[PDB]
């Protein structure tokens, strides 16, 4: 429906033929789904297409053309199939590397299924609201949006349920001041988005309120969907350092390749002309040794890592945050959903007992049962007691039942009593059901009926006229009640107040004692406050609520209800009744999680609604502070924080581990101050108010069970809201890194080997140790089997014992670049030494133990001077198989050196990555085929002796393991 902003609500409902109270029928949904498509951008559409990509490379085709010119010169005159073989190998090297890249990219794309765009509809098939994938929303259905929600489609507003609807449309209009909405038509059909004040645009936010509307356009037809068509679409620090190093390596190898075409100056004449031989050998090294385009295994362990993370409940939204994740040095976490289970239970409570001048005594009680079940006893001095015998408890229960927007619900399949409203409130419902202050019959009730039986007995003694909702300035709420149907002696209207102890107790002029009343004094106040403190500070670190009644409340038309700031005044002149103490245990895995952070050099900062005293005590229980540690400079309330000068506030964030009772703007500030010390901070949040901080944080972390706005501003979502999930995500972050570095080390050294190998032959003047098709053969087996197996190796051993990596750190340290050269140098020398060994000290027709092989160039005509042997044993097919076999086996060996960055094979055995071992055996069974299955050794070279020759291949290759061990020792025992 194109111009819905200009028509009446009644015209929009008319247009689609939809009831506003009902919503679309399954039949309508079905027909609309066909007519209008899904609420999404069209999927953009491969196996063969991606193979040709590699053949676009200039240096790849330079090889092919050189093997074509070499083939044509043969046909008009091994060398015959050379162009056919290379082509087959290079399609295979392409297939292997292009197939990994696409699967990694698909798996990473498939992360979006963990947190799919959701919408809320009323449809004809249910009375209740239905949460569905935004994708399945259709033009014409009835949509409900409220605070924190992302608008799922372009919607004409039907009715605003809250007093006011506030919308953040910045993403579409640039204005970042939330905007007011209405319901009347906006007559101008040409009107700009800014003027469509009755409209809700897909991709935007509800910054406050609640509204119902009808969907006008979806998918592409939507305002943001038109923009996303015309829209046309930044490298991470580790991507820059890898690209830059990619060019440093690329140009050195390119110079050395041309240096191979030069030093073989005169040799263009032996059996302008022979340069096609030394050119086609130089270009092959370029194709094998230079890594052009991102190696696929890299993107594979990122893909394997975030898949692992998602299974551990950390949903990565921003991939660049996987890089930041192992640099995090600070975690700021909210307490309730995250450090604690949020399973509330009242385990303690008290009322006033006796008051005599300075003297005040209390009736304390404890309550068993910690789930939401109405099952447990009320104890005093450890003895079971009946709450109704205490008139003050009758009143305390009346307050808990009336100051409450929650109920219990028995879930018949799960067999469990579940919560309806807020955990805190439901804990009070549960309590009330256990106290059963009026001795109502409950024993014969079904579990369904039992859930709220006692709460309703209370709820029938009065009418709940209205509620003074909670607000942050007073930290208390209240309800206003009149007696129902009229009792015997018409007692006046009442108010019941619950809230934070400190604030409500100050507003009390009286205290209840039984059913009698007595003036609030200093002595009574001190006694009330001391027990609040003991329970706040004791083993169970309880959250205390104070409960009061205003005995003589104002008249009704004295009280304005749309103005939250007059609410405190109405809640004065109170009568203190009693206190309840709530349990909310720390999660089981949290102490261990915090100790891991200590070990990894990560500071943890708790933010809580608890009072300061309690906040500290929780921190001692969970290991954030030591049970004796001084804390006076490391713990702050938002109030104390606001009273500090700016420089002092800053210094407080340098060292603080505990913030209690913070204004909504504090998180942002903490982020800023932490950044002023180059901290890499992770910050949790869930509300529309947490969004600015989540934006500023290096890693914003949103709660799975929280708002979409917080999720949209974050890098990561916690599926289970759990603090431990965060720590485990740092664990993976660091692991992925070490996995990249293990693959990078193996890739660089093996390619450097290829270079040193060939350069040594051309430099000294030796006969070619490896023919180009052999080089392209090894280059394919390694990159195909063992190299991709390292993408599947386990986490490195002590990644949570090193401190966090700096963002300014270089990708490859000098020491590491040494480990690249030293290892690459030994392989290059070992391959050329294995061919030269056959010539020097080997029993199969040798050269000279002095040095004669250098001048192999002069033989066929230069026989009588300094030879005395045949001159075709330099084209022999055995020295080139010794060089090949040493390369292949030292490549399998070099892979065992890539199981861990710094751990010895004595600690991390070869069988740690069991897939690596497999791919080796697969690599060997392929090698035992180009030496034995009889058409192939002809196209390459001929086999090595059954025993004695292999023992040299092994005694040459195996010290590569021994060498890297020393270099690992000079890294383990160096630190």
């Amino acid at each position: 429906m194109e111009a819905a902003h200009s028509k009446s609500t009644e015209e929009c409902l008319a247009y689609f033929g939809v009831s506003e109270t009902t919503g679309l029928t399954p039949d309508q949904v079905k027909r609309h789904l066909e007519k209008y498509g899904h609420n999404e951008l069209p999927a953009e559409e491969s196996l063969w297409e991606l193979v040709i990509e590699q053949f676009e490379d200039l240096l790849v085709r330079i090889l092919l053309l050189a093997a074509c010119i070499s083939f044509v010169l043969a046909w008009f005159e091994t060398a015959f199939v050379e162009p056919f073989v290379i082509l087959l190998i290079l399609i295979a090297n392409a297939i292997v590397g292009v197939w990994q890249e696409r699967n990694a990219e698909n798996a990473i794309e498939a992360l979006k299924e963990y947190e799919p765009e959701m919408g809320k509809v009323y449809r004809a098939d249910r009375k209740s609201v239905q949460r569905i994938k935004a994708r399945d929303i259709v033009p014409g259905d009835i949509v409900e949006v409220a605070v924190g929600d992302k608008v799922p489609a372009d919607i004409r507003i039907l009715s605003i349920k809250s007093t006011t609807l506030r919308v953040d449309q910045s993403i579409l209009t640039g204005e970042s001041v939330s905007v007011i909405k209405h319901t009347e038509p906006v007559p101008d059909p040409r009107a700009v988005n800014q003027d469509k004040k009755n409209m809700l645009f897909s991709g935007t936010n509800i910054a406050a309120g609640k509204a119902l509307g009808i969907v006008a356009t979806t998918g592409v037809s939507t305002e943001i969907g038109k923009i996303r068509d015309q829209m046309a679409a930044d490298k991470t620090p580790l991507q820059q350092k890898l690209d830059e190093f990619g060019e440093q390596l690329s140009k050195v190898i390119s110079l050395i390749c041309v240096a191979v075409w030069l030093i073989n100056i005169g040799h263009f004449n032996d059996p302008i002309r022979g340069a096609i031989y030394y050119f086609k050998i130089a270009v092959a090294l370029a194709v094998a040794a230079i890594p052009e385009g991102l190696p696929a295994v890299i993107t594979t362990c990122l893909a394997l890592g975030t898949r692992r993370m998602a299974k551990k409940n950390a949903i990565v939204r921003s991939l660049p945050s996987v890089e930041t994740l192992g640099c995090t040095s600070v975690i700021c976490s909210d307490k309730t959903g995250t450090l604690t289970t949020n399973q509330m239970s009242v385990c303690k409570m008290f009322i006033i007992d006796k008051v005599d001048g300075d003297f005040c005594s209390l009736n304390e009680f404890s309550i068993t049962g910690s789930t939401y079940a109405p099952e447990g006893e009320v104890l005093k001095n450890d003895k079971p007691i009946r709450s109704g015998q205490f008139d003050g408890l009758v009143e305390l229960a009346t307050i808990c039942a009336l100051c409450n927007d929650s109920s219990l619900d028995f879930n018949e399949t799960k067999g469990v009593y579940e919560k309806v409203g807020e955990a805190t409130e439901t804990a009070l419902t549960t309590l009330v059901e256990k106290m059963n202050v009026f001795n109502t019959e409950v024993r014969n009730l079904s579990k369904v009926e039992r859930a709220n039986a006692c709460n309703s007995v209370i709820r029938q003694l009065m009418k709940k006229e209205f509620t003074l909702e909670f607000s942050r300035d007073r930290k208390s709420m209240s309800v206003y009640c009149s007696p129902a149907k009229s009792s015997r002696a018409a007692v006046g209207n009442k108010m019941f107040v619950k809230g934070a102890p400190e604030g409500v107790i100050d507003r009390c002029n009286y205290v209840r004692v039984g059913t009698t009343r007595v003036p609030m004094t200093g002595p009574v106040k001190e006694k009330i406050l001391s027990v609040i403190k003991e329970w706040g500070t004791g083993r169970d670190t309880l959250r205390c609520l104070a409960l009061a009644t205003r005995d003589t409340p104002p008249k009704r038309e004295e009280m304005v209800l749309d103005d939250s700031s007059r609410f405190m005044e109405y809640e004065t002149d109170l009568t203190f009744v009693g206190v309840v103490g709530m349990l909310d245990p720390p999660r089981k895995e949290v102490m261990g999680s915090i100790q891991l952070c200590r070990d990894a050099g990560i500071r943890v900062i708790m933010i809580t609604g608890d009072n300061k005293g309690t906040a500290i005590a929780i921190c001692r229980r969970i290991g954030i502070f030591g049970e004796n540690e001084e804390v006076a400079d490391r713990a702050y309330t938002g109030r104390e924080f606001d009273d500090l000068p700016l420089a002092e506030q800053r210094e407080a964030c340098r060292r603080a581990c505990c913030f209690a009772r913070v204004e909504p703007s504090h998180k942002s500030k903490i982020v800023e101050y932490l950044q002023s010390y180059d901290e890499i901070t992770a910050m949790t949040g869930d509300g529309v108010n947490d969004a600015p901080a989540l934006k500023k944080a290096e890693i914003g972390i949103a709660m799975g069970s929280g708002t979409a706005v917080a999720k949209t501003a974050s890098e990561m979502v916690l599926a289970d809201d759990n603090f431990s999930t965060i720590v485990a995500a740092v664990e993976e972050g660091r692991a992925i890194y070490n996995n990249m570095k293990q693959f990078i080390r193996y890739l660089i050294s093996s390619n450097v080997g290829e270079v040193v190998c060939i350069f040594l032959t051309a430099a000294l003047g030796l006969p070619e140790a490896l023919i180009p098709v052999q080089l392209l053969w090894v280059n394919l087996v390694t990159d195909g089997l063992p190299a991709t197996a390292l993408g599947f190796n386990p986490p490195d051993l002590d990644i949570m014992d090193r401190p966090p990596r700096s963002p300014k750190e270089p990708l490859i340290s000098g020491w590491l670049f040494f480990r690249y050269m030293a290892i690459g140098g030994y392989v290059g020398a070992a391959t050329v030494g294995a061919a030269a060994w056959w010539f020097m000290y080997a029993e199969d027709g040798p050269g000279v133990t002095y040095h004669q092989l250098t001048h192999f160039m002069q033989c066929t005509e230069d026989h009588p001077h300094f030879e005395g042997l045949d001159c075709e044993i330099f084209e022999a097919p055995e020295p080139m198989t010794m060089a090949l076999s040493v390369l292949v086996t030292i490549e399998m060996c070099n892979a065992l050196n890539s199981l861990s960055e710094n751990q010895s094979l004595m600690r991390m055995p070869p069988w740690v990555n069991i897939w690596l071992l497999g791919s080796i055996c697969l690599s060997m069974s392929l090698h035992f085929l180009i030496l034995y299955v009889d058409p192939l050794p002809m196209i390459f070279k001929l086999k090595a002796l059954d025993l004695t020759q292999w023992l040299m291949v092994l005694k040459i290759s195996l010290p590569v393991i021994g060498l890297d061990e020393i270099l690992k020792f000079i890294a383990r025992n160096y630190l």
Partner: peptide
């Protein structure tokens, strides 16, 4: 067996790709 089981799938595809390559060099001749 769940995530480790995609290593066998990954290598087998690469093995087949390399093996097919050799058998084509066999046939040509």
């Amino acid at each position: 067996p769940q995530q480790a089981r995609q290593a066998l799938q990954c290598l087998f595809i690469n093995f087949c790709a390399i093996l097919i390559c050799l058998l084509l060099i066999c046939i040509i001749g």
